[PDB]
């Protein structure tokens, strides 16, 4: 039918938070308290518009 429109690798290269996972769990509560305030905007963007490649910024 129609082609897909997948974005570029130069936009798909952000440095991860390359911590391990157990410390990421161990710091999670204060990660949810102070930060994770503007990512409910992200999650609402995801659940309203179900398109990753649309809400990646």
């Amino acid at each position: 039918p129609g082609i897909v429109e997948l974005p570029s690798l130069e936009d798909l290269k952000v440095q991860e938070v390359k911590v391990s996972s157990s410390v990421l769990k161990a710091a999670a509560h204060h990660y949810g308290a102070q930060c994770d305030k503007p990512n409910k905007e992200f999650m609402l963007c995801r659940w309203e518009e179900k398109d990753p490649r649309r809400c990646l910024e």
Partner: protein, 68 residues
């Protein structure tokens, strides 16, 4: 002299009684002990269950805040 074997001076008594001391107590005491220890275990189990419910909700908070 004579050296047979008679009973020398007579032998003492030998019991033949059915001597059963009936160790233990009444059955109503046994039901009381059983129900009491059982209910003790129930209360302690209830308390530990709801403590682990609190910690399980905290682990749910971990998986919620960890996800995005």
């Amino acid at each position: 002299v004579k050296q047979d074997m008679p009973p020398v001076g007579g032998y003492g008594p030998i019991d033949y009684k059915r001597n059963l001391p009936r160790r233990g107590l009444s059955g109503y005491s046994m039901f009381a002990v059983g129900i009491g220890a059982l209910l003790f275990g129930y209360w302690s189990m209830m308390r530990w269950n709801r403590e682990r419910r609190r910690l399980q909700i905290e682990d749910f908070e971990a998986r919620i805040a960890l996800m995005p």
